Amino acid sequence: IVRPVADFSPSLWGDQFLSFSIKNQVAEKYAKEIEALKEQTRNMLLATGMKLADTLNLIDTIERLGISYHFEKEIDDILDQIYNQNSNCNDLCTSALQFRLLRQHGFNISPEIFSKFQDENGKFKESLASDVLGLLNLYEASHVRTHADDILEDALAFSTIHLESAAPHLKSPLREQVTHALEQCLHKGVPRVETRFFISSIYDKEQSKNNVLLRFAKLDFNLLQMLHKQELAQVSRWWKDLDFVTTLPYARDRVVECYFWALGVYFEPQYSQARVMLVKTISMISIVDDTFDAYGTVKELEAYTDAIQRWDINEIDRLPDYMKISYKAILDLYKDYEKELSSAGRSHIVCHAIERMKEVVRNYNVESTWFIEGYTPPVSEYLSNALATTTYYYLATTSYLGMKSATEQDFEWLSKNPKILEASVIICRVIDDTATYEVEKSRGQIATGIECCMRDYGISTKEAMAKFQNMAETAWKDINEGLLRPTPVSTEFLTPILNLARIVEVTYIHNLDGYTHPEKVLKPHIINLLVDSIKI
Ligand SMILES: CC(C)=CCC/C(C)=C/CC/C(C)=C/COP(=O)(O)OP(=O)(O)O
Ligand SMILES: [Mg+2]
Ligand SMILES: [Mg+2]
Ligand SMILES: [Mg+2]
Helix, strand or coil, rough: CCCCCCCCCCCCCCCCCCCCCHHHHHHHHHHHHHHHHHHHHHHCCCCCCHHHHHHHHHHHHHHCCCCHHHCCCHHHHHHHHCCCCCCCCCCCCHHHHHHHHHCCCCCCCCHHHHHHHHHCCCCCCCCHHCCCCHHHHHHHHHHHHHCHHHHHHHHHHHHHHHHHHHHHHHHCHHHHHHHHHCCCCCCCCCCHHHHHHHHHHHHHHHHCCCCHHHHHHHHHHHHHHHHHHHHHHHHHHHCCCCCCCHHHHCCCCCCCHHHHHHHHHCCCCHHHHHHHHHHHHHHHHHHHHHHHHHCCCHHHHHHHHHHHHHCCHHHHHCCCCCHHHHHHHHHHHHHHHHHHCHHHCCCCHHHHHHHHHHHHHHHHHHHHHHHHHCCCCCHHHHHHCHHHHHHHHHHHHHHHCCCCCCCHHHHHHHHHCCCCHHHHHHHHHHHHHHCHHHHHHHCCCCCCCCHHHCCCHHCHHHHHHHHHHHHHHHHHHHHCCCCCCCCCCHHHCHHHHHHHHHHHHHHHHHHHHCCCCHHHHHHHHHHHHHHHCCCC
């Protein structure tokens, strides 16, 4: 008796990532020049007597070039002084850039800086329609607004229509920059993805470009990439020596895509241990999801759920043979995590990710019960269960394990479901439900998010999808507020949550599943970050 037929596609990568040997003489040549270039760039930033506009473009450029992680103190000192001087007598270009940079760094600059660009209605003067650089910087700023910033309600609609109108007659590479911004704003994009584009497609082709910065950025990207390929190789060998590819054939083989996810949360060198731990957890929870979703009967899913709650190797024999495989690999993974952290006396913190995982599994089992019964809950009740099945409470907790500065007090903050984490989870939930509604409705999912929304409020599929779209917009306003100073925990521990929200937006862009169907969205990203170097 049982089970379903297989419909998931295999790893489109094969074994091309399994073996990477660093050219050690090259790695050392790149690092040699980067040291030199890094200090020239420090002295650019610490130059006395620059104009406001010149300082902001410098800082903007270093950030989009992806080398700003080298200068976090310098950039901060400078923005703090800009914030505290209240300078605005400027143009739309400089004002909007000033607003965006300060807010992204948590400085609660007043949105009244924009009042001089508006009439008596809080609607932007149409005489600004001929100023393309002003419109571009306004467009990017409009994505960083909060609930206190309703003066900016018109800014996205206003800049968009006039950038669309101007774009075809613009010189290059400006035209390519405007066209790309309309597809993907800076604030909600994945940082490595935006950096690759900017270095190669834009800055490399500017006539105004600074040669020192460009070469710095190219060498730095390509050097980090060698690190990332080493990480991916070692994770690929771990996945292979597990061999779920042949013994648990019902599950997707997506370890490379899971690594891309992890790289989106943080790309810097100091988080290499954190990235390796995170990707192992993503790929394992993905197998557990396919067990609930694509193979296991209601009886054995109940046994799997209770074994996860009790968390004890003694429990394996109460499970079907095929569940013994994954269950043992899960218990083993956390015993590994404990050993790796034993060297800095941080083993005790592992228990936090584990409790979050038990929670994910309970809700997988509820979601299954709803399916068998054909139950369509209220939107209220649907959310109470379906928020945790995004796994985002659990990946956020897991992202802290490998960060050497995460303290127990940091995990306690996160355990209370703070507002910035709840918003990141809400974005994942509603975007995934909008993108995959038809996919599931076709194969009997009565308990799908949009369908609860339709039955509850008594509305069409169009109106349901627009209410979800709107929940996502509210959630971004709450993320943006959550970054403002004074912060509840250090900023280092907020950025991973923000980056989780960015991954959703990039993966589900234009509205179909990019994780299940990687060749859609992710394949070109993975090639640009992890296969092709930037050509010097
Ligand atoms: C939610 C999400 C996009 C997570 C991305 C990162 C991650 C943990 C992937 C694991 C596998 C997963 C949740 C696939 C979605 O399919 P599904 O339809 O079984 O997921 P669902 O039950 O959350 O809709
Ligand atoms: Mg599922
Ligand atoms: Mg699934
Ligand atoms: Mg789904």
